[PDB]
Write an enzyme that holds these catalytic residues in place. Structure first.
Site, PDB file in Angstrom:
ATOM      1  N   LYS A 117      39.762  36.192  43.348  1.00 49.91           N
ATOM      2  CA  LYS A 117      39.216  37.468  42.920  1.00 49.91           C
ATOM      3  C   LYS A 117      40.007  38.583  43.591  1.00 49.91           C
ATOM      4  CE  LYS A 117      34.894  39.836  42.071  1.00 49.91           C
ATOM      5  NZ  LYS A 117      33.425  39.842  42.287  1.00 49.91           N
TER       6      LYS A 117
HETATM    7  O1  LIG Z   1      43.141  45.445  43.893  1.00 54.48           O
HETATM    8  P1  LIG Z   1      42.040  44.968  42.862  1.00 54.48           P
HETATM    9  O2  LIG Z   1      41.945  46.018  41.818  1.00 54.48           O
HETATM   10  O3  LIG Z   1      40.786  44.550  43.568  1.00 54.48           O
HETATM   11  O4  LIG Z   1      42.552  43.643  42.151  1.00 54.48           O
HETATM   12  C1  LIG Z   1      43.926  43.409  41.695  1.00 54.48           C
HETATM   13  C2  LIG Z   1      43.976  41.917  41.001  1.00 54.48           C
HETATM   14  O5  LIG Z   1      45.242  41.628  40.587  1.00 54.48           O
HETATM   15  O6  LIG Z   1      43.541  40.946  42.014  1.00 54.48           O
HETATM   16  C3  LIG Z   1      43.663  39.502  41.713  1.00 54.48           C
HETATM   17  C4  LIG Z   1      42.830  39.171  40.428  1.00 54.48           C
HETATM   18  O7  LIG Z   1      41.353  39.305  40.564  1.00 54.48           O
HETATM   19  C5  LIG Z   1      43.209  40.176  39.337  1.00 54.48           C
HETATM   20  O8  LIG Z   1      42.425  39.870  38.211  1.00 54.48           O
HETATM   21  C6  LIG Z   1      43.051  41.695  39.787  1.00 54.48           C
HETATM   22  O9  LIG Z   1      43.423  42.621  38.690  1.00 54.48           O
END
Ligand SMILES: O=P(O)(O)OC[C@@]1(O)OC[C@@H](O)[C@@H](O)[C@@H]1O
Ligand SMILES: O=P(O)(O)OC[C@@]1(O)OC[C@@H](O)[C@@H](O)[C@@H]1O
Lengths: 324, 325
Positions: A320
């Site tokens: 995530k």
């Molecule tokens: O910096 P954030 O906006 O929390 O997240 C940035 C991101 O690349 O992290 C890893 C995965 O969950 C992706 O789906 C997400 O877009």
């Protein structure tokens, strides 16, 4: 949770407007702005940079790691404000990037986090998401910042209710989108868009890639004829997103159909360009117009994922939050 | 077949480029704020030129021709002191349409006298002629010619053409190694990774594979790949990491892809073992010229993959050598 979250887009717009009104007189966005983010947040950064330029400012967007290790190759120049975008507010790369920045910092996130603690001000838009794949938070973040940008630049406010209702219209296409997935088992897909819709095409492609572990590509509309179109045939769905199409678009649609590909046109026009599938969205202020397109591409990616027996909430190999 | 022959003319292309540079160096003065326009591979070259311009203290921005034509307001173009139109053929409709809308000085970069040169104030005509629909050695030749002109314009010493040409000869020595990778690991998709000047090289490398092999190829700034994109890499994937000076994060990234089952080819200017399955070490050059030896490597990889699939890289299906409207 992915589908539930996509469907919360209308409410996300309302939540965004509320946050905007709470902070609008506490921070004034300047002319020269640097936007930083990773993954979908990088594509959002590109979108924000574009709308900044559209409104007379000077915006530049870069992936966090490129700012960290190769900033010299980018035209950053003097920065009056650095905007760090992170849904989680915990991404290691964005935190590393901001600690190296001395100018004013504005964070855009869904929650109080490591990010908000290192920024001078923050737009905390509570478009909470359990899914690994970012959906309505992208749309909500964009609207909140757009309102703030218009306000800072002396422009009238957008009507949050009108825009929220516009996304409800996008959601009415859910069954139709499911039918596309059911009636045409495409093996790869290409998203096309120009201007503000180019970052939307990039985001759309990532949604399909993450949710469906799929072969998806995205290009500025007409750039696709330059070699890229070679991988489009009878197993390809081409998604052309365009606000006001002209002759070149009709020719492009025909060109892809001649290669055997099927074409879905998402536009704000009643024009028949020869497309196989058509989704017409409510036309809004040019800057806000891309908003209704997001739920459409998110739904398309979601249903294609389900058709492959995949779980869009937790795509294989993904975390995530990317941490180091 | 002409594609392979053309890839192998890279060394001579560098020499030809140096000759053009020396002929025009005192007739063309490059400014601080430069806009680079191009389509397809020429757009990726434009991105590379914009980056090196920034690296040397100037202000460079690159845009695909059609985006400048229909959506310029969304880009940070600002005041332009020079518009550089890049077109191998010099006949691409979009570049002609783009340049005729510009009033400032215009410089063309092409392989032949053409519609493009006829509408520019001056041009860098680098005769790295190519019959293949796929651009190969003209990319590095154009890059070197302009790089020399940029350095000269900015008061920097000239690069050693002979040394750079020799460097590409070293790249070509990897032909057998590259062919054997293609013959032993039947990858079904591929990802090219690079940062800074190597990012546009990754974009170009991906397009070479896409055009030559009608393949599923992707390219990203090195570490951005962990952000969702890596989900499509498994045991059927070859990951190509291009890096001049690798550090801790690169070893971790290589291991992460291997943990997903993918095989990793590292092309670098370092003898460091990051855990890669395949390794190609290239001669390290001045930072701005360093990307040059990487091009023939990715061109050769794309060429051999194409042959392994019975495809003709000279004339990819559906493609026209020159895109017109
Ligand atoms: O910096 P954030 O906006 O929390 O997240 C940035 C991101 O690349 O992290 C890893 C995965 O969950 C992706 O789906 C997400 O877009
Ligand atoms: O403007 P040019 O540089 O001539 O060419 C641009 C380009 O996209 O045209 C169509 C094909 O030949 C491609 O391989 C080539 O890169």
């Amino acid at each position: 949770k992915t589908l539930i979250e996509i469907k919360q887009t209308p409410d996300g717009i309302i939540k965004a407007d509320k946050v905007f009104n709470k902070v609008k007189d506490k921070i004034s966005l300047p002319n020269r702005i640097l936007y930083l983010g990773c993954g979908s947040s990088h594509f959002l950064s590109k979108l924000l940079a574009m709308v900044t330029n559209m409104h007379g400012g000077l915006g530049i967007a870069l992936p966090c790691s490129e700012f960290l290790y190769s900033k010299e190759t980018y035209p950053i120049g003097e920065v009056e404000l650095a905007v760090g975008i992170s849904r989680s507010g915990e991404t290691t790369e964005i935190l590393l990037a901001l600690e190296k920045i001395n100018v004013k910092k504005l964070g855009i996130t869904t929650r109080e986090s490591s990010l908000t603690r290192m920024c001078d001000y923050s737009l905390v838009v509570p478009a909470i998401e359990e899914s690994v794949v970012m959906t309505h938070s992208f749309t909500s973040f964009y609207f909140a910042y757009l309102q703030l940008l218009r306000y800072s630049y002396g422009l009238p406010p957008l009507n949050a209710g009108e825009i929220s209702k516009a996304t409800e219209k996008s959601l009415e296409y859910e069954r139709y989108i499911r039918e596309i997935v059911e009636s045409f088992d495409f093996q790869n897909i290409i998203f096309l868009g120009s201007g503000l819709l180019y970052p939307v095409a990039l985001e759309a492609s990532l949604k399909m890639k993450e949710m469906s572990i799929f072969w998806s590509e995205a290009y500025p509309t007409f750039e696709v004829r330059h070699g890229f179109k070679a991988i489009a045939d009878e197993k390809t769905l081409v998604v052309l997103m365009v606000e006001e199409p002209f002759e070149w678009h009709e020719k492009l649609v025909k060109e892809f159909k001649n290669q055997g590909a099927k074409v879905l046109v998402i536009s704000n026009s009643p024009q028949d360009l020869g497309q196989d599938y058509s989704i017409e969205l409510p036309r809004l202020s040019k800057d806000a117009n891309p908003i209704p397109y997001l739920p459409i591409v998110q739904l398309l990616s979601y249903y294609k994922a389900v058709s492959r027996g995949l779980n869009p909430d937790n795509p294989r190999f993904l975390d995530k939050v990317v941490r180091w």
